[PDB]
Amino acid sequence: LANVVILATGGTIAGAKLGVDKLIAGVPELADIANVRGEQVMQIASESISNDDLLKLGKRVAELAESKDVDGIVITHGTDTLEETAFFLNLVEKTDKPIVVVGSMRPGTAMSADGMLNLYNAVAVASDKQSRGKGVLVTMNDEIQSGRDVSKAVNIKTEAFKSAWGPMGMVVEGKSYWFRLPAKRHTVNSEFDIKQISSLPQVDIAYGYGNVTDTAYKALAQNGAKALIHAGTGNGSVSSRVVPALQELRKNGVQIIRSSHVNQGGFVLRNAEQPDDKNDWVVAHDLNPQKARILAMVAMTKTQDSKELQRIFWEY
Amino acid sequence: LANVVILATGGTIAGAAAKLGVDKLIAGVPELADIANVRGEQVMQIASESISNDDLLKLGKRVAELAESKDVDGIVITHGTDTLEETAFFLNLVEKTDKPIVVVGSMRPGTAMSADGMLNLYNAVAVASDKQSRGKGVLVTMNDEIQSGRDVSKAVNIKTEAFKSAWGPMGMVVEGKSYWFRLPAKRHTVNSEFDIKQISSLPQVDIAYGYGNVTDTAYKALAQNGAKALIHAGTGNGSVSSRVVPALQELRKNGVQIIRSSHVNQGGFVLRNAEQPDDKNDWVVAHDLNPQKARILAMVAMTKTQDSKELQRIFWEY
Amino acid sequence: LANVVILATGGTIAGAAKLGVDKLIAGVPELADIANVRGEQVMQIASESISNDDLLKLGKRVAELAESKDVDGIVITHGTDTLEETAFFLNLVEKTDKPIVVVGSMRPGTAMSADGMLNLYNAVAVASDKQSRGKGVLVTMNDEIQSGRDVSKAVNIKTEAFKSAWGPMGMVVEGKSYWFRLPAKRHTVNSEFDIKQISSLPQVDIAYGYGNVTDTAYKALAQNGAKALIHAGTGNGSVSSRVVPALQELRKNGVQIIRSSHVNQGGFVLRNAEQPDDKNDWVVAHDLNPQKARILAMVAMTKTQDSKELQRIFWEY
Amino acid sequence: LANVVILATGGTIAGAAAKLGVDKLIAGVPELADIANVRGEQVMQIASESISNDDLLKLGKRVAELAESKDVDGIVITHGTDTLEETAFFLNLVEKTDKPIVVVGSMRPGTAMSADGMLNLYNAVAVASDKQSRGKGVLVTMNDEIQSGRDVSKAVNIKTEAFKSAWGPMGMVVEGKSYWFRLPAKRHTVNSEFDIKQISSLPQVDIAYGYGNVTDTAYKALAQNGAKALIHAGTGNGSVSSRVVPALQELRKNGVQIIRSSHVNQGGFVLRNAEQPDDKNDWVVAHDLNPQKARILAMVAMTKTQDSKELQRIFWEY
Ligand SMILES: N[C@@H](CC(=O)O)C(=O)O
Ligand SMILES: N[C@@H](CC(=O)O)C(=O)O
Ligand SMILES: N[C@@H](CC(=O)O)C(=O)O
Ligand SMILES: N[C@@H](CC(=O)O)C(=O)O
C-alpha cells in the first residue's frame, strides 16, 4: 500500500478543534487504501493564515517530498484560503510526488458531513500513480481539480470548488478518472523552489468598483505592499480617477497587477483596457485576485522586472 | 407601438469606449422602427469603470423624469458592462415605476466582427416595449436573456455571455419576443421604500478584500477617507481574519457600518452569526449580494437609516 | 409544529430501495425538532422502472393527504432517475397550496458522507414552511429549493445532480428557507388539470435524433400504441430529411408530434424555426426536455386532442 | 502564412440553412487574408440534422487527403451545429495527423443582426494556422473558446454559447491568438488505433431513450432494422427499466452490443457494474460520453472489434 502523510492545518474539516489523529480515526477505511500517518502542522481557521504559516507548511511539505518513506502528501485545510495554499504549493514544491489539499463545507458532526469522503478521496489520489507529476490537486465533490485555478466559488454547498477550465478528473470508489491534463507550469517544471525561499514579499489586494478612490492602493503601499493586485471591474479596468495614483505607485516601485472580480471565465488581456506597456503594469491573465497575489509573492522572490512578471503570469 | 426612450451613458456598445452618440447608436439598428417609436438622449459619455456617484445620481434623476412623463412607455439605458450591474441594481432600488427599465451593454464595439451590440439594443427595446416587462423591476437583456438588474453580474470576461445570476436568467428574448420562466422574489421599483425623488446625495461606501495574510490597513484608511460603511469582500462565508476583527470592532464603535460580503460569487450566501458574531459586533451580512452590489444597497439604504437592524432587514428583503 | 407525511417510493435514498419508511424517519431523529412526521410506504421501486400506474397511485394518495385537515405538508422520497418526471407530474395535477416536496439521494445512507439524511431533513423543513405554500412542487437536494417543473437530473454521481436551466428558486440552510425567485409557469392550484379526474394516462413514447437516424423507432413506437411521440431532436428540435415523411403520416393518422431536444442546459425549441409546425400540425416542447415533455404530453391529452391547445399548454406549464 | 483549407458542408453558418457556397463564406471574412492563405472546397451542402454515415466517410476521406498534402498546414470544416459534435468526435478518432483540424458553425446566419459566423470562422482559421493547435486533436472554436471535439456538445439552444464540455474549454481565442489552459487526456488523432485510410463503411449503430413507462419496443425494432449496437440513453447512471433488461439480454445473446450512456449530460459518468451487472450481461458503459457521441465511438470501434471487453477498453481510453 502507498505511504501517505496527512499534514493537518485546521479548517471546518477539523470542527478547527480536532487533531489529525482524530481526523484519521474518523475515516477507518483509510487503512484499506494507504499506510497513513498524521502531523499537526498548525490548527487555524484558514481566513486567518499568515505568510509565516505558508512558508512553514511549504518547508514541511518539501521535507516530506524528499523522504523515500513518503509516496504522497495530503494537506487538510480550511476551505476559505484552500485555493491560495494549493496554488502556492503548486509553484514552489519541485516534486512529482502527489500533493492533495482538501477541506470540507460541513464539520464531521453535521448531518451529511462531506469531510469523511473528501479525506478518503484525498488519500486515494495521494496514493494513485496517475497523480504523479500532475501538480497540486484538490479532491472535493468527487472531482480532481487543479490547485492552480480551482477557487471557492459557491458558499455553503459541497460543490464550493470550481475552475473556469473544468475539473481535470473525478474520484469514485477510490478510483481516479482523468479527462484533462494541466497546460501551465507547475512543481517539477517550476522555476521557483521553497528550498531557495526564506521570506515572501508583501503583496496586498485592492477592490475596483464604481466611485472607487485611490485610498486603499496608497495606504496599502505605505504599509508595506511591494505589489498591488488590482481586483478590477471587467477586463481589469481602472477608473480614470485612480490611473494617476497607479502611475505614481509604479514609479514609486510598486508592481501594478490587473486582475478582476469577473471570476467565472475569460481573462485580462494586456494593453486592452489600459496601456500596460506604456505604464509598466502587468495583467494577471485568468488568475483571480487572491491567486494573482500568490503568484506575485512567489515571483518577486526571484525578480522585480515587470517584463519577467508578465511572462510568469503567462506561464503559471 | 410603445414610446421607448434610449438614455446613452457610453460603454463599449458606443465604442469605436464611449465615442458614438445615441443618434448613431439608433441609426445603426434600423429595425428598431418596427418594434417601437424610439428617441435618444445622451445623458453622459463615459467608460463605466470611471462612473462617479455624481453620474449615478444624475442617471437616476433623469430616469425618474422620463418614467413620470405620459409620452414614455419604456426606458433603455445604454451602458458600459464594467459597472452595468451596479447601475442596474441602483435603478432597481430607487425608480418607483412599473414602466420597463432595461440596461444594456455589449462586450464588443459595433465596428468589431460579430459585434453583440445591435441585437442587444434591439432586444432591450423589444423588452422595454413589452407589456410583460411592466412591474418586473430593472432588467438586463444581453446574450438573448432577460436577467434581473438585482443579482445579474459581469462574471465572464471577453465572451458575450458575460452576465450571469446565481438564481438564473428570468427569461429569454428571441426574434423580438419575451419568454418568462421565473419572477423576482425581492423588493424592487414600485414596492421599494426608497425613491430617487427624495435622494439627492449618497453616503460614501467603500470595499476592502479578504485573503491570506491580509491586514486592517485598507479598512482603517478607507474609514479615515470618509467611508460610512465598509463592505468586507471576505473569503468564504464573509470570513474575517483574527488580525482584522479588532479594527472592524473599533470602526463600528466609531459609527462605521461593517457589512460582510464575499468573493464567493457563483452561489450561496453569507449567513448571519455563522463565521462572525454579528449580533455581538452589531455587523450586517450582505446575504447573496457580491461586494459591489452590497455597496449600492448599503449606500441607498443609509440615505434612510443608520440602524444596523434595519440595514440587515434591507439586506434580507432587497 | 406542522404535520408532515412522508410517502416512501424507493430509491437510493432508501438503499443498503431496501429500507422501509419507518427506518428512513428513525435515521433522521432531528425530524422531531421541526415537524410531526408520519410515514407511509406507497411502493418500493428503483425509479428507472417506474410506470404510469405508479404515478397515478402516488398522485391519488398525495391528493387524499392534501384534502385532509391533519396534513400540513407532504414529502415523497424517490429514486433520483425519474424524480424529475414525478415532480413535474405532481406539479401539473395536484390542486393544493399545501407544500409538496420530492427528494432522493445520490448515495445510500450506508455510504461515507451520505447526502440522504440532510436531504430528508431539508425536505421536511421546506414542507413545514409557510413560505412553501402556493410555490408548486419543490425538490430539496444540494441545499437548494428547485422547481419540480424544470429541475432535471443533469450531473451523474455528484450530490449537485439536480439543475434547472432557470436556476434554483431558493436554498434551505439549517432548516430555514431563503427565496430568490418565484415560479412563472402554471402549477398546482392554477392548473387546469386535476389528478381527481385522471383514471389512466395516454401512452407516450420518446425517440432520439442523431446522425443517420431513421424513421424506425418512431413507427415501431406508434405501432405499439404511442398516442404522441416526443422527438428528442438534435439542436432546435431538428428533424432529419429521412424522418419528416414518417412523422407527417403519423400526424395524419392522429399521433401527436412534439419537438423536444437533447440540448438541455438552456434555451428552448422555437415553433416554426427548424420545421414548419403550423403546416404539419406539430407541437414544440418549449424548454422542456424529452422526459419532461412526455409528462406534459400525457397530462395535456387527458383534456384535449387539438394540437393548437397542446401548443398553448406547452407555452403555459 | 499557413495554408488553411475550409471544407464547407452546410449549416446555419451558410444560411441566407446551407445556401451560401464556401466562396461567399470566405468573401464575408476579408480579414482571413491577414492570418492565412485560405482555399476552399464545397464537400456537401446540408442541414447537419440530415447528415448520413456516407456524408461522414466522404468528409473523413477528404480531410485525410488534405492532411496528407504537404501544401496544407491546417483544415477548417464549416458545419451545421446540430451534429457538429458527432462529426468532430468522428474526425478526432479516424484522422491520424498532428495537423490542426477545426470544426466550426454558427447559431445565427450571417444576415442576422450580431451574426456569430464571421468571428467563429476567423477564429477557426486562426487556430488551424497556430502551431499551438498541432497535436491537440480536433478542435471546436465557437464563443471565443477552444473546445475538444471529443466531448464538446450542443448543450444550449438559441444562444451563441451553445457548445459546452463537462471538462471545460481547453482554451480561448481572442484577437486571433490562442491561449491554452488544459490539454487532452484521451486518445486522439495520431495516437488513435483507428484510421479513415482503413475504413470503407461503418456498422449501423442506433439510439434509444430511457424514461418512465418505457418499453423494449424501440430497442427491438432498431435491432430488427439492422442495428449492430444499441446506445441506451438511460436515466441516471445508465439505468435500465426492469421492463427492458430481458429484451437487452436477448439482443446481446443475438450478437447486438448494448452500450449504457445517459441523458445526464452536464457531468459525471456511467460507472461499470453500478446500476446494471455489465460483466454478467456482457454489456459496455459509455463512460462520460453522451448517447450521440457513444454512437460515433461504437461505430468506429466496431470496424476493428466485436469483443465487448475491447469495446469497454476503447470507451475508457477515447
Ligand atoms: N472558516 C473555515 C471554513 C471552512 O473550513 O470551510 C476555514 O477556512 O478554516
Ligand atoms: N470598459 C468598458 C467595457 C464595456 O462597455 O464592455 C465600459 O464599461 O464602459
Ligand atoms: N436507480 C436509483 C438511483 C437513485 O435513486 O439515486 C433510483 O432511481 O431508484
Ligand atoms: N439546422 C442547422 C443548425 C445550425 O447549423 O446551427 C444545422 O445543423 O445545419
- Who among B81, B157, B263 is closest to A265 (CB)? B157
Provide the pairing of β-strand B2-10 with C162-163: unpaired
CB B155 within 8 A of CB A264: yes
Tell me the shortest Cα–Cα distance from D243 to chain A, in angstroms: 29
Helix/strand/coil percent split, chain A, to 5: 35, 25, 45
Closest by CA to D32, choosing from D43, D20, D40, D42, is: D40
> Neighbours of A (≥3 Cβ pairs closer than 8 A)?
B, C, D
> Neighbours of C (≥3 Cβ pairs closer than 8 A)?
A, B, D
Residue B57 amino acid letter: L
Q: For residue B274, give the ligand nearest its CA.
A: 1
Backbone dihedral angles phi then psi of residue B100, each to the nearest 5 degrees:
-60, 125
CB D115 within 8 A of CB D25: no
CA D197 to CA D220: how far, in whole Å?
33
- What single DSSP character describes residue D145? E
Q: Which residues pair with A67 in a beta bridge?
A: none
- Who among C150, C168, C180 is closest to B186 (CB)? C180
Closest by CA to D241, choosing from C73, B178, C46, A40, is: C46
Sheet with A169-172: strands ordered across: A34-44, A2-10, A72-76, A99-102, A137-138, A143-146, A169-172, A175-178
Would you put residue C265 in left (φ > 0), alpha (ψ -120 to 50) or beta?
Answer: alpha
Calculate how far, in angstroms, residue B156's C-alpha sits from the geometric centre of ligand 2: 13
Cβ partners under 8 Å of residue D166, min gap 6? A166, A179, D151, D265, D266, D267, D268, D288
CA D245 to CA D230: how far, in whole Å?
13
Which helix H or strand E contains D310, and what residues bound it? helix D308-317
Question: Which of A27, A102, A112, A114 has the most C C-beta neighbours within 10 Å, making it the best mutation to test the interface with C?
Answer: A112
Ligand 3: which atom is nearest the Cα of residue D275? Answer: 1
CA B93 to CA B318: how far, in whole Å?
8
Closest by CA to B262, choosing from A294, C142, A153, is: A153
Structural Rg of chain D based on CA atoms: 20
Ligand 4: which atom is nearest the Cα of residue D79? Answer: 5
Q: For residue C79, give the ligand nearest its CA.
A: 3
C79 lines ligand 3 (CB under 6 A): yes
**Which of D9, D12, D83, D97 is an active site residue?**
D12
Residues of chain C contacting D164 with CB distance shorter than 8 Å = 265
Pocket test for ligand 4, best of D49, D78, D81 (most atoms within 8 A of CB): D81
Calculate how far, in angstroms, residue B18's C-alpha sits from the geometric centre of ligand 2: 8
Tell me the shortest Cα–Cα distance from C147 to chain B, in angstroms: 10
Residues of chain D contacting A142 with CB distance shorter than 8 Å = 268
Residues of chain A contacting C112 with CB distance shorter than 8 Å = 27, 29, 116-117, 120
| Contact state of D169 with A170 under an 8 Å Cβ cutoff | no
Backbone dihedral angles phi then psi of residue A9, each to the nearest 5 degrees:
-130, -10
| Contact state of A165 with D180 under an 8 Å Cβ cutoff | no
A46 lines ligand 1 (CB under 6 A): yes
What's the full length of chain D, in residues?
Answer: 318
Backbone dihedral angles phi then psi of residue B44, each to the nearest 5 degrees:
-175, 175
Calculate how far, in angstroms, residue C45's C-alpha sits from the geometric centre of ligand 3: 9
Q: What is the per-residue DSSP string for A206-260?
A: EE--TT--SHHHHHHHHTT-SEEEEEEBTTTB--TTTHHHHHHHHHTT-EEEEEE
- Who among A215, A234, A269 is closest to B82 (CB)? A234
A275 lines ligand 2 (CB under 6 A): no
Q: D132 burial class (0-12, 13-18, 19+ CB within 10 angstroms)?
A: middle
Method: X-ray
Closest by CA to D22, choosing from D108, D94, D146, D117, is: D117
> Does the annotation place D78 within a ligand binding site?
no
> Does the annotation place B239 within a ligand binding site?
no
CA B182 to CA D135: how far, in whole Å?
45
B155, B156, B158, B159 alpha-carbon torsion, rounded to 10°: -120
Set of cell numbers at residue C187: 402549477
Neighbours of C303 (CB within 10 A): 14
- Who among D83, D87, D218 is closest to C207 (CB)? D218
> Does the annotation place C80 within a ligand binding site?
yes
Cβ partners under 8 Å of residue B49, min gap 6? A208, A232, A233, A234, A237, A238, A239, A273, B80, B82, B83
Provide the pairing of β-strand D101-104 with B229-234: unpaired
Cβ partners under 8 Å of residue A316, min gap 6? A91, A148, A184, A185, A186, A190, A295
What's the full length of chain C, in residues?
Answer: 317
Set of cell numbers at residue C49: 422502472
Calculate how far, in angstroms, residue C48's C-alpha sits from the geometric centre of ligand 3: 7
Give the dihedral sign, CA B152/B157/B162/B167.
negative
3-state SS, one letter per residue, for chain B = CEEEEEEEEECHHHCCCCCCCHHHHHHCCCCHHHHEEEEEEEEEEECHHHCCHHHHHHHHHHHHHHHHCCCCCEEEEECCCCCHHHHHHHHHHHCCCCCCEEEECCCCCCCCCCCCHHHHHHHHHHHHHCHHHCCCCCEECCCCEEEECCCCEECECCCCCCEECCCCCCEEEECCEEEECEEECCCCHHHCCCCHHHCCCCCCEEEEECCCCCCCHHHHHHHHCCCCEEEEEEECCCECCCCCHHHHHHHHHCCCEEEEEECCCCECCCCCCCCCCHHHHCCEECCCCCHHHHHHHHHHHCCCCCCHHHHHHHHHHC
Residues of chain D contacting B161 with CB distance shorter than 8 Å = 143, 159-161
Q: What is the largest CA-CA distance in chain C?
A: 61
Which residue carries 445526464 as its cell?
D264
CA D86 to chain centre: 3
The residue ranges of DSSP E strands in chain C, in sequence order, are 3-10, 36-45, 73-77, 100-103, 138-139, 144-147, 152-153, 162-163, 170-173, 176-179, 181-183, 204-208, 228-233, 256-261, 283-284
Residues of chain A contacting B296 with CB distance shorter than 8 Å = 210
Set of cell numbers at residue D289: 460520453
Ligand 4: which atom is nearest the Cα of residue D107? Answer: 6
A272 lines ligand 1 (CB under 6 A): no
| Contact state of D181 with A178 under an 8 Å Cβ cutoff | no
* Structural domains of chain A in order of their starting residue, each with its CATH number: 3-189 (3.40.50.1170), 194-314 (3.40.50.40)
CB C103 within 8 A of CB C119: yes
Provide the pairing of β-strand C170-173 with C144-147: antiparallel
- Alpha helical stretches, state H, chain A: 20-25, 30-33, 51-66, 82-92, 115-126, 215-222, 243-251, 276-279, 289-299, 306-313
CB A149 within 8 A of CB A135: no
Closest by CA to A88, choosing from A77, A155, A268, A16, is: A77
- Cα B105 to Cα B15, B62, B121, distances in angstroms: 11, 19, 8
CA B113 to CA B122: how far, in whole Å?
18
Ligand 3: which atom is nearest the Cα of residue C10? Answer: 9
Exposure letters C19-38 (e unless 16+ CB within 10 A, then b): bebeebbeebeebeebbebb
Provide the pairing of β-strand B229-234 with B205-209: parallel
Which residue carries 442587444 as its cell?
B120
DSSP 3-state assignment of A21? helix
- Cα B218 to Cα B34, B101, B205, B223, distances in angstroms: 52, 36, 13, 9
Which residue carries 427599465 as its cell?
B101
C48 lines ligand 3 (CB under 6 A): yes
DSSP 3-state assignment of D141? coil
CB A143 within 8 A of CB A170: yes
Structural Rg of chain A based on CA atoms: 20
Resolution (angstroms) equals 2.1
Q: What angle do CA A290, A292, A293 make, to 5 degrees?
A: 60
Q: What angle do CA C52, C58, C64 make, to 5 degrees?
A: 135
Residue D184 amino acid letter: P
Set of cell numbers at residue D97: 495527423
Q: At what angle do helices B217-224 and A215-222 cross, to 10 degrees?
A: 130
CB B271 within 8 A of CB B285: yes
CB A156 within 8 A of CB A51: no
Which helix H or strand E contains D64, and what residues bound it? helix D53-68
| Contact state of D174 with A149 under an 8 Å Cβ cutoff | no
Ligand 1: which atom is nearest the Cα of residue A12? Answer: 5
Q: For residue C77, give the ligand nearest its CA.
A: 3
- What single DSSP character describes residue C270? P
DSSP 3-state assignment of C235? coil
Residue of C nearest to D82 (CA): C235
Residue D235 is a catalytic residue: no
CB B113 within 8 A of CB B165: no
Set of cell numbers at residue C295: 409528462
Tell me the shortest Cα–Cα distance from D155 to chain C, in angstroms: 4
Which residue carries 470595499 as its cell?
B207
Q: At what angle do helices C290-300 and C307-314 cross, to 10 degrees?
A: 130
CA D313 to CA C205: how far, in whole Å?
33
Set of cell numbers at residue C92: 401539473
Which helix H or strand E contains C314, and what residues bound it? helix C307-314
Q: What angle do CA C288, C203, C146 make, to 5 degrees?
A: 30
CA C77 to CA B13: how far, in whole Å?
50
